[PDB]
Amino acid sequence: SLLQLRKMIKKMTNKEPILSYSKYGCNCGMGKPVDATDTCCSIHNCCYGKVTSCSTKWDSYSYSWENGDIVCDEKHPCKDVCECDKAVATCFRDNLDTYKKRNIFHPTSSCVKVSTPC
Ligand code: NA
Ligand code: NA
């Protein structure tokens, strides 16, 4: 669920997830990604687009932490959603080096909207 994703983002990045990532660039919370962090969201949106069995927003899944990584429970019916969320939270962590707070106020008109992002 979205509530779990937020927890994953908070632990992966140490940032408050709503302020920091719910509205970032052109893809987070929604065009061509403006940077690496925005690309994480682009990939995440596409990942969610392949989910058929569960509600990406509403359904909860099962996971753990092992040695710095998120491990999705393979037995859970919504494990594909977990994998999407694991990947975006990890991707955010891996791109904090170029994260820019100015991208939270990114004007949608500046986004070059593409036809096939996935
Ligand atoms: Na923060
Ligand atoms: Na754990």
From the candidates 44, 73, 80, 106, give the one annotated as an active-site residue: 44
CA gap 22, 16 in Å, rounded: 10
For ligand 2, the distance from its centroid to the CA atom of residue 61, given in whole angstroms, is 13
For 67: left if phi > 0, alpha if psi spans -120 to 50, otherwise beta; the answer is left
- 38, 80, 85, 106: the active-site residue: 85
> What domains sit in the chain, N to C, each tagged with a CATH number?
1-118 (1.20.90.10)
- Pick from 61, 54, 57: which is nearest to 22 by CA? 57
Ligand nearest to the CA of 19: 1
* Cα 65 to middle of ligand 2, angstroms: 4
Question: Is 106 labeled as catalytic in the residue annotation?
Answer: no
H or E stretch including 72? strand 69-72
Method: X-ray
**Burial (CB count within 10 angstroms: exposed 0-12, middle 13-18, buried 19+), residue 108:** exposed
Confirm whether 73 is a catalytic residue: no
59/77 Cα distance (integer angstroms): 10
Residue 63: in which H helix or E strand, if any?
A: strand 63-66
Collect contacts of 64-69 with beta carbons under 8 A, ≥24 apart: 65/11
Give the burial class of 88: count Cβ atoms within 10 A of its Cβ; 0-12 exposed, 13-18 middle, 19 or more buried.
buried
62 Cα: distance to centroid of ligand 2 (angstroms) = 10
Q: Facing residues of 72 across strands?
A: 63
104 CA distance to ligand 2 middle (Å): 30
